[PDB]
Design a binder for this molecule. Sequence first.
Ligand SMILES: [Mg+2]
Ligand SMILES: [Mg+2]
Ligand SMILES: [Mg+2]
Ligand SMILES: [Mg+2]
Ligand SMILES: [Mg+2]
Ligand SMILES: [Mg+2]
Ligand SMILES: [Mg+2]
Ligand SMILES: [Mg+2]
Ligand SMILES: [Mg+2]
Ligand SMILES: [Mg+2]
Ligand SMILES: [Mg+2]
Ligand SMILES: [Mg+2]
Ligand SMILES: [Mg+2]
Ligand SMILES: [Mg+2]
Ligand SMILES: [Mg+2]
Ligand SMILES: [Zn+2]
Lengths: 97, 166, 204, 50, 26, 110
Amino acid sequence: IGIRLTLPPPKVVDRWNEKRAMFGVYDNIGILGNFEKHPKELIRGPIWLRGWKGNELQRCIRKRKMVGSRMFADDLHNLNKRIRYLYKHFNRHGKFR
Amino acid sequence: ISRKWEKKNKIVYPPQLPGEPRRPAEIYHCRRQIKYSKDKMWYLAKLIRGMSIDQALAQLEFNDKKGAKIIKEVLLEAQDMAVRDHNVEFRSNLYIAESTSGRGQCLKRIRYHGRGRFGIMEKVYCHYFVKLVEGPPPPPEPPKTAVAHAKEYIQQLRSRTIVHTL
Amino acid sequence: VTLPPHYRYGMSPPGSVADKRKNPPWIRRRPVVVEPISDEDWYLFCGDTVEILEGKDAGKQGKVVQVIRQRNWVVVGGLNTHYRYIGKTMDYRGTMIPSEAPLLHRQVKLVDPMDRKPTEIEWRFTEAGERVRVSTRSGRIIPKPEFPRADGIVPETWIDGPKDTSVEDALERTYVPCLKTLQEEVMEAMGIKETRKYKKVYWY
Amino acid sequence: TEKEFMQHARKAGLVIPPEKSDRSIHLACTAGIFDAYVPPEGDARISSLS
Amino acid sequence: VKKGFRAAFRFQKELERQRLLRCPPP
Amino acid sequence: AAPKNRRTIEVNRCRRRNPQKLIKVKNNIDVCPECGHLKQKHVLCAYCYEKVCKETAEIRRQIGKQEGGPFKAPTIETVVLYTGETPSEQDQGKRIIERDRKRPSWFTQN
RNA sequence: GCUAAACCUAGCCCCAAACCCACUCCACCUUACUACCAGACAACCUUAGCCAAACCAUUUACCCAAAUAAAGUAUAGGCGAUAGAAAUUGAAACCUGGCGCAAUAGAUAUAGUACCGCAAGGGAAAGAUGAAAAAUACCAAGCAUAAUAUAGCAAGGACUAACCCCUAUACCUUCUGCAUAAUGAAUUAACUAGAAAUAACUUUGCAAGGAGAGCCAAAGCUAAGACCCCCGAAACCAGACGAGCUACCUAAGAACAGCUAAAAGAGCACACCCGUCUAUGUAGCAAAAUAGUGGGAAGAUUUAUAGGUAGAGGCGA
RNA sequence: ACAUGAAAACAUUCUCCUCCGCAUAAGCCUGCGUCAGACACUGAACUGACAAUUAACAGCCCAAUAUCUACAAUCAACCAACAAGUCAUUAUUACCCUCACUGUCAACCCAACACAGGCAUGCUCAUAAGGAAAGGUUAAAAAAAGUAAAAGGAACUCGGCAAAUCUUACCCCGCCUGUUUACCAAAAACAUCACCUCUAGCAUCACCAGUAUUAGAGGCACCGCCGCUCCACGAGGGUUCAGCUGUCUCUUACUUUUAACCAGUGAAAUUGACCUGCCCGUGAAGAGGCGGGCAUAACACAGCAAGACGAGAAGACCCUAUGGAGCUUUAAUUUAUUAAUGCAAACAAC
Ligand SMILES: [Mg+2]
Ligand SMILES: [Mg+2]
Ligand SMILES: [Mg+2]
Ligand SMILES: [Mg+2]
Ligand SMILES: [Mg+2]
Ligand SMILES: [Mg+2]
Ligand SMILES: [Mg+2]
Ligand SMILES: [Mg+2]
Ligand SMILES: [Mg+2]
Ligand SMILES: [Mg+2]
Ligand SMILES: [Mg+2]
Ligand SMILES: [Mg+2]
Ligand SMILES: [Mg+2]
Ligand SMILES: [Mg+2]
Ligand SMILES: [Mg+2]
Ligand SMILES: [Zn+2]
């Protein structure tokens, strides 16, 4: 019980597909391009997560302040509740003071 | 589920040279999903265990338990295909080798109790397994006689060595 | 037409006794991945001789009797057939007759009628614009084989019944276009006279 | 509690495939000899008279 | 179903050892 | 009162498989001299008792059909007669029951 | 060897991009899904409280429409917990995405269905063959195979030898101290609980300079590594749903044998209403009952139907 | 823990019971009609298919505008009332088409169930209708119900509780009557006629379509006397006479149910693991498990309740929480709210 009685199907990985064979290209565009472009501008992803990093609390304010007006009603309510809980936990709880 | 008992009748041994003796015939038969308790059916299986087929039928015919008639039919059809399909010459030259009961699939029902309480009752089902071997039943093991006790005690006394030394 | 979203198609037609038993309404099996083939791209039709490529008996040619577009299945009569017992009862052993097995459209290849060799085929238009299929090598015209129609009617041997309209009566035209409805034309035909007028009502 | 078995099995043999179907079972051989041949009596002695 | 391969691989060797012990070859 | 600890399977085996809990072997089983079916020494044979009841039921069915109504019990003796039989010299003034069957071998005629 | 055990899809999550659906016929605001009669009926009005300041009366962050910076600065505040700007500065863009989940996971979802609730509302479980069904071996726990022979946390040292010999006061948690007769645990499988970089430490880079505007610097500056759990109250407030049980009321109904008496909130006594005492029952027939015995039984009596009073409230012999 | 009265040709007959039965309304919605696939083959209150309940009963009504309607009911005649009641038209205009639609079954509704409960009305007042307490056996303990009992008759007991019998008187409290803690209190508690106190001079949804002999808010609890007695009554709390009885001295016998065995179906609390003995001592201070002694083949069934600080709801009982809630107030902070006055505003009011 709790373990499979047969071997899982073997997995095949293409180490030389288009994405793997050219990962990291243009990451030094700023150094080698007279600083006309920043490697941060190559970041592809969420609007509030482009060239920025922070803890869970900080990510919630940044999402709310930038795209909060466009979120769904249920999602906005949950995001507001998450900020309230995170604010209480970080500013009032912990081993260290 | 598992149904290995049925497949036990499909194994075929290679032909035997005249030098080796006759391999006794064996038949595996079982009835599934019997509306009976496996604990209650165990007593009947143990009762007819090791006895002849026809003696077992006589004992089961006059038994008042409901499971007795179920085993009686199972033994009867087991004897039929033994002669018909398993190259058994004499239908009365059979003895019970192993008879046992196993738990079957059971349902769960609600039994109402007072004060709004309830209890989960269970509709018990069980299987019955039986193996028949051609030939007279083996003689029962005789009681161990006093002389047998005497030699065994002597052997223990003669098998002791000086311990914790060379 | 009552099929589950992940219904699996089999040899038995949907709704048949065997299909209902094999595929109960509550069954949920893993869907079978089938390469999509467009209606125009498909070139396998009933009654066409097809040369099978991969099988226990390769190199043989046969005519497809049934085609399943949902699973890209081609069934060739007398080819790729296993064996089974028919009419099995508790007292009878059963009748042994061969039974075909499904074959994929890639497991088989169309054959040139003039040259008994598989060829690759493409769809090309004729001079009149009617669509045909032309083979890659030694291109020619291979039309759709004539097959018995599903309803089982044979117009070449059709006889009108007591309740069957004659061709001349069915094809002759009596409609004279005009600005009258069915009701008023019928009413004047039968001479029905209605002097009373319809008073205006309120609609909302 | 209401859970029960799936005992919806109906006895089914292999007699007739569904009708009004273009596909039909292909037969490779006939059921029996078209004309019965009665062996002449004494063919065992005819075997000796090769 | 738990993703992973080493645990299943180790289990297969253990079963084969049991199968070997169940009926050792001549 | 509730159990204090769970009883182990070793203890349960010692109780459930006790010799007096087992079914005792019956040694009063013998074959019927007439039909060859098993019977007990002190119990009537099932085969022969049941075949007598069916004949008794058939005769009783003939009894009611000839009777034709409740509360009409005859005040005379009754004798059942089979096919190809005639009333006896001592069989006079007694109700006669006709059975469309041959008299059984075990049914000895007086 | 039996109840079983295993499986890979169904589908889902987070982003990018892009602004979405709603008349076959018929019915559907009256008791919705009901072919067909004189009306007048109207929407708009600061949220509160939990919680934190270890109480609390005061106060206590909640997208408001450009990221970064100015800056947690100026200011506000039982000047205390905490709250918190602006002037000014100025931003990039190449979906064809996943070091996301794989049936106790991922949406609750096979479905807001089954089922529970008068209503508002709550809310599941599960599937697994194969190319073809027109082919029908080994694994938890529990048992069985195979009940048991002095003696004892069940084991260890051993031994020719299972036991017999000798030794040994179960685990976790809470307390100074538990074999403790203090809590927790029948057993198995799965699920289930340490989140943050102010300073300091370690290791690169550069160096009186460091940093890809802003910031720091009297060897500093930049970068990286590395520290801060889970479940559980009685409560408070806001908005809905409830008087088919019950408290009371309104509309119009119905029931009360016989005897004594007298025009009786009279007496005996059925139907009927109630429930004084005893016994039975105590997972029961019953989440308040049965048997007997009792009070009332023409009245402030009993009872069927429809309607009204709703929680900061109603109703109350 | 649960069940199916008996014989039999399964035609029928027999024994026993009814406090039930039929219909309507309300409710429910095909839920023991046919065919096929505890008990069960015809097995069936399960599944699939087929079949059905036909309107005269009932439901579903009414042209308009004006105008009428003092005198109960109770055999309604006497009589006697108060609580003052449950049933009526006419004038004129308009008006002549007609039998449409729906309810109609059942062993049935609310109680988680085929639940000993709850459930309105009309007939039957013992049935002309509807049903079966015993699956079989034995006749141990123990438990429940019933019957019988020598002699005595409350000596039993907190108490004449129960049972038998069908008695008398007294005290306390409450006038009586009625009402309440649905589910531990039916009372001395509450309401109650009667009496007393306070407030109100009046229209168009309550009071009220009323007006100081009225209305509202209260206290007390009739009558009577000058705070106290008196009738009647009470499932209220005490006492007593006589009788009565197994309450007792002192229990015994019999019947039924549980009971035990046989066959079928088959729960719940509980459970760290157990190979689970006694005495004394020791110990977190009350030991089957530690120490010293003793006892000791294995094993099931029926009883017993001394122990396993037995089991069942983090029980009740005391303390803590800078934990709650209900109530009170001359606890602290308020008048936002309402009402009444003053000023301003507006021209006596709003
Ligand atoms: Mg109930
Ligand atoms: Mg009367
Ligand atoms: Mg009275
Ligand atoms: Mg009392
Ligand atoms: Mg019992
Ligand atoms: Mg009995
Ligand atoms: Mg006496
Ligand atoms: Mg006394
Ligand atoms: Mg009494
Ligand atoms: Mg009273
Ligand atoms: Mg009470
Ligand atoms: Mg009072
Ligand atoms: Mg039994
Ligand atoms: Mg507090
Ligand atoms: Mg508080
Ligand atoms: Zn016989």
